[PDB]
């Protein structure tokens, strides 16, 4: 019943969340020629690890969906959840917040580091 790789790309963001594993899998799997193949293999690894580097820092590693403690800023978007989840593709959404992607990432990283600092302190008090 799978839509296949990127088959969800035209779907709404809410519907697309069903297929996250389809995209997550095959990120690693899918003489003049010999060197080009080697470059392709190294590049695919760097690509995969780039996203994993961010997830490990965010504490989101090992999860397809990761909730955070960073509040949404209305300046990033003023849309209601129905306007986003039931009326947009992820392709459209990425364009809407393309200028804020790095800003959001830094805020997530800051929140994770403070959270772990606090978790340690809570354990130290026990």
């Amino acid at each position, epitope marked *: 019943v799978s839509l296949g790789f990127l088959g969800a790309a035209g779907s709404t963001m809410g519907a697309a969340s069903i297929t996250l594993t389809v995209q997550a899998r095959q990120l690693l799997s899918g003489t003049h020629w010999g060197i080009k193949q080697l470059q392709a293999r190294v590049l695919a690894v760097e690509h995969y690890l780039r996203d994993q580097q961010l997830l490990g820092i965010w504490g989101c590693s090992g999860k397809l969906i990761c909730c955070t403690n960073v509040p949404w800023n209305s300046s990033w978007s003023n849309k209601s959840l129905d306007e986003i989840w*039931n009326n947009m593709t992820w392709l459209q959404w990425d364009k809407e917040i393309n200028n804020y992607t790095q800003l959001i990432y830094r805020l997530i990283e800051e929140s994770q580091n403070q959270q772990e600092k606090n978790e340690k302190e809570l354990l130290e008090l026990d």
Partner: nanobody
Amino acid sequence: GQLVQSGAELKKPGASVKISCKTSGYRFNFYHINWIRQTAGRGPEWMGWISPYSGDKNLAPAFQDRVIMTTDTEVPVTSFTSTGAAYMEIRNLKFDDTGTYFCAKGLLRDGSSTWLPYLWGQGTLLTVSS
């Protein structure tokens, strides 16, 4: 998004009429096209709706034998917008059918309320006389 409709015209009783609904500024296939009628003696009433994506339609019981809905194939403008048109045909017109006819755009691509008529065209008058 914007919707426009065929201009008002006079018909004889029993005559057929066809009303176009040209659209722009949004993807035509992403949303339902609704048709809604208003008359002085009835108020607003649904004629049902059609989905350009599947071609499926839901006609209200009152109109099932007299109303036919069709759509044109969409023509893209941008990767996220297109143009196209819906058409509705009414057969066996009566004086009771006189009033304003509206074309309207569906609300959402998903969720419980996808077909609601979020955007409306200006609407045009249909008149019947012998």
